[PDB]
Design a protein around this ligand. Structure first.
Ligand SMILES: *[C@@H]1O[C@H](CO)[C@@H](O[C@@H]2O[C@H](CO)[C@@H](O[C@@H]3O[C@H](CO)[C@@H](O)[C@H](O)[C@@H]3O)[C@H](O)[C@H]2NC(C)=O)[C@H](O)[C@H]1NC(C)=O
Ligand SMILES: *[C@@H]1O[C@H](CO)[C@@H](O)[C@H](O)[C@H]1NC(C)=O
Lengths: 304, 105, 307
C-alpha cells in the first residue's frame, strides 16, 4: 500500500512528495520499478532499503517528486517483480467525481512522412469506460473513398480507454488541399463528436538553416555540443534530423524546441546534439537536415 | 527560562522546523539565532546538545561566497549549517528539518 | 515529525479507510501521543501505538483509522506529542482538487536578475480559466510559517480566444527566499466546487555554473540590413535563469530577444537558447554584442557573460 505526503494545516501542497510502502513477504530477491502512466522513471530518484523483522522481510521505496509534477494530473505505478508474477499498485492526485466529456485529437502528418518517407498518416487519438462502444468513422470533404484505419485500443492503468486510428492519406492529395473528416460516437455523449484537419493554408516561406559548433571548455574533453538554428518559415510544421556517415541519427539523441514566432511573420526552432570524441575523429562532418512545405530543392534544406 | 553562561542568555528550543522557521521562533521570543565567537562558549552548547542536531546562526548569502553570522559579524572560531551531537559543524540543506533550535540574547 | 496519508487509486478515487502519522527518531524515554479533531481529543481505541529501537535512537509510529465520510467532511487532524519539553504539533487536512472544470493555476519562482541584480524578487500566479462566468477569482496569499504578506497586483486580461487570465504579482523578500521560505497561494471561484492550491520555494539541490556560448549568423540571400544572433546557455541547476542582451553598455528590453523554456540535458544539467535580431545601423556603430546570464551558482558576483 502506497502512502503519500500529507498537506499542511491550510490544505496547501508541500514542495516535495514522498510515496510507497511494501508489506512483509518470504525472504528472497525483489525488483521494484517506478512508472509514470506506463513509462519507466529513473532509478536515481528512488531509494531502496530492506529490513528483516522476525521471519518475514520488509522493503520500502521512496520517490521524490516536485509540486508541478504531482499536480499535473499523472498516475504513478509501483511495479513489484517477485517469483515471476508481478504486483501493481497505482497512486494519483485527488480528483473530482468524473468531470468533463470525451475529448478527441486529430493531428496533421509530419513533414518526414509527407516528403522523405512519402507515406503520410493521420492519427486520431481519443481520450475516454462504461462499455466498449467507441466508433471511429472516416469520410472526406468532397466525398471520395477512404482506406481502413488501424483501430488499436490501449487500456491505461488510471482506468481510462485510449483508442487510436491511423488513416493512410495521399501524398499529392494533402498538398493540393484535401480536408479529412472523422466521426466519434458514444452512448454516454448526447451529440456526435466530429474533428477534422487539413493543410494549413496561408503564406509559404523557405527555412533558413545555420550550423554552429561549440569550442573546448575546461572540464569537458571527450564530449562536445552542436547547435543548429532553423528560422523564417510558415506553417509551423517542421522535421529536424541530424546526419553522420550518410545515415540518420536516432530521435532520442537530438533535442528540438517548440515552434516559436519570430519578430516578424515567420517561425524559429533550435536543435541541440551532444557528440563524443570517437564521432568527430572518425568523420568531422555534421549536417542537420530540415524538412518543410515551402522548402527547395525537393523539400530538402541542409547545412554542414 | 533562558539558561545563562558568561553573560549571554541561551534558549534550547525543541520541535521539527526548517532553518528559516527556527529563525522566526528566536525573533518572536525576543532575540536571534546563536552566534559563536569564543572557544569556551562551544563547551556550554555541547552539554545541552541534541543527538539529532541543532540549527546554528551560520548561513550563505551566495553574493560574497563566504559564510557570515546572522547578526552580521564575520566567522572567526569554528546552504544552512547545523551543529552535530559531538560539537563540530557541517554543511546541510535549506529545506532540511531538525527537532532542535538554539536562540541567544 | 511528518504525517503520511493513504494514497488514492489509479482513477483518483478516495479509499474507504484512511491511515495517518509517522514519528521520527528521538532519545530513549516515555512518550505521550494524543489524536485531535480540530481541538477535540479522539478515542484511544481507534489508534494503535508501536515502539521500535534502532541503534541508539528510538522510533514510534501511530496509526489512526478513519472512514471516507469523516476525512472528506473537511476536518483538520492534529497529532499531539508530549515529551520533556511540553507539546508538539503537526496537522493534516484534505487535498483540494486539481484542474476543476478545466481551470489550471501556475506559480513561478522569481528570476535570478530580480533576486541578485535588481534585488526586488516577485512571484507571479498565472491562472488560466476556460469558462468565464458570473463569479470571482480570489487569490489568497499566505506563508508556511505564518508571517504577514503585502498586497499583490491583481490584473485580469481577457484574451481574444474567449478565455480570462488573471495574474497576481507578490513582492517577496531577498534574504527570505535564499534561506528557504515557502510561499502558499489559494484560488477560489463560486462556480467551481473545489479550491485550487499551488505553492513554490527555493529548489534545494545541486549547484552548477552556466556555460555561455555566443554565435553570429552569416549573410543569407534576400536579407541585407538585418542579421540574427544565437546564444547557448547550458549545464546549470536549478532551472531558474535570466537572459539579457547588451549593446553600448545599455541592456535591451523583452522585445527582439526570445528565450526557450528550460529543457533537461542528457545528463544532470539544463539548457536554454536565446535569439536576437539586429539591423545594419547597430553593428556598424558598434561591432560587439554581449549576452548576460544570471544564475544562483554563477561566478563572479552571479554574472557570467560572453561576447
Ligand atoms: C491516464 O493516463 C494517460 C496517459 O497515456 C492520459 O492520457 C494523456 O492525456 C493527455 C491529455 O488529454 C494527452 O495529451 C494531449 O495530446 C495531444 C496530442 O499530442 C495534444 O494536442 C494535447 O495538447 C495534449 O497534450 C496525451 O496524449 C494522453 N496520452 C495518450 C497516450 O493518450 C490520461 O489523460 C490519464 N487519465 C486521467 C484521468 O488523467
Ligand atoms: C488562449 O490564449 C492564451 C494567451 O495567453 C493562451 O495561453 C491559451 O492557451 C489560449 N487558449 C486556447 C484554447 O488556445
Amino acid at each position: 500500500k502506497i502512502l503519500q505526503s500529507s498537506c499542511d494545516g491550510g490544505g496547501h501542497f508541500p514542495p516535495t512528495i514522498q510515496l510507497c510502502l511494501v508489506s512483509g513477504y518470504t525472504p528472497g530477491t525483489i525488483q521494484i520499478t517506478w512508472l509514470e502512466d506506463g513509462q519507466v522513471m529513473d532509478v536515481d530518484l528512488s531509494t531502496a532499503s530492506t529490513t528483516q523483522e522476525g521471519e518475514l522481510a520488509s522493503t520500502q521505496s521512496e520517490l521524490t517528486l516536485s509540486q508541478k509534477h504531482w499536480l499535473s494530473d499523472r498516475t504513478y505505478t509501483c511495479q513489484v517483480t517477485y517469483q515471476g508474477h508481478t504486483f501493481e499498485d497505482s497512486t494519483k492526485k485527488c480528483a473530482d467525481s468524473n468531470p468533463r466529456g470525451v475529448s478527441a485529437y486529430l493531428s496533421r502528418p509530419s513533414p518526414f512522412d509527407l516528403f522523405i518517407r512519402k507515406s503520410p498518416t493521420i492519427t486520431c487519438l481519443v481520450v475516454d469506460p462504461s462499455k466498449g462502444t467507441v466508433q471511429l468513422t472516416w469520410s472526406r470533404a468532397s466525398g471520395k473513398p477512404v482506406q481502413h484505419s488501424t483501430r488499436k485500443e490501449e487500456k491505461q492503468r488510471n482506468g481510462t480507454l485510449t483508442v487510436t486510428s491511423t488513416l493512410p492519406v495521399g501524398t499529392r492529395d494533402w498538398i493540393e488541399g484535401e480536408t479529412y473528416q472523422c466521426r466519434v460516437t458514444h452512448p454516454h455523449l448526447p451529440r456526435a463528436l466530429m474533428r477534422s484537419t487539413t493543410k494549413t493554408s496561408g503564406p509559404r516561406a523557405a527555412p533558413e538553416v545555420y550550423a554552429f559548433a561549440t569550442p573546448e571548455w575546461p572540464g569537458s574533453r571527450d564530449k562536445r555540443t552542436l547547435a543548429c538554428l532553423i528560422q523564417n518559415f510558415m506553417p509551423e510544421d517542421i522535421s529536424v534530423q541530424w546526419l553522420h556517415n550518410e545515415v540518420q541519427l536516432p530521435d532520442a539523441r537530438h533535442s528540438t524546441t517548440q515552434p516559436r514566432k519570430t519578430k516578424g511573420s515567420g517561425f524559429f526552432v533550435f536543435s541541440r546534439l551532444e557528440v563524443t570524441r570517437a564521432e568527430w575523429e572518425q568523420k568531422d562532418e555534421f549536417i542537420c537536415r530540415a524538412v518543410h512545405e515551402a522548402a527547395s530543392p525537393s523539400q530538402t534544406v541542409q547545412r554542414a | 527560562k533562558w539558561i545563562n553562561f558568561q553573560r549571554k542568555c541561551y534558549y534550547f528550543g525543541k520541535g521539527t522546523k526548517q532553518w528559516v522557521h527556527a529563525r522566526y521562533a528566536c525573533d518572536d521570543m525576543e532575540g536571534q539565532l546563536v552566534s559563536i565567537h569564543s572557544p569556551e562558549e562551544q563547551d556550554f552548547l555541547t552539554k545541552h546538545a541534541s543527538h539529532t542536531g541543532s540549527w546554528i546562526g551560520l548561513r550563505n548569502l551566495d553574493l560574497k561566497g563566504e559564510f557570515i553570522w546572522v547578526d552580521g559579524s564575520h566567522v572567526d572560531y569554528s546552504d544552512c549549517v547545523m551543529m552535530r551531537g559531538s560539537g563540530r559543524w557541517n554543511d546541510a540543506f535549506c529545506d532540511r528539518k531538525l527537532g532542535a533550535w538554539v536562540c541567544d540574547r
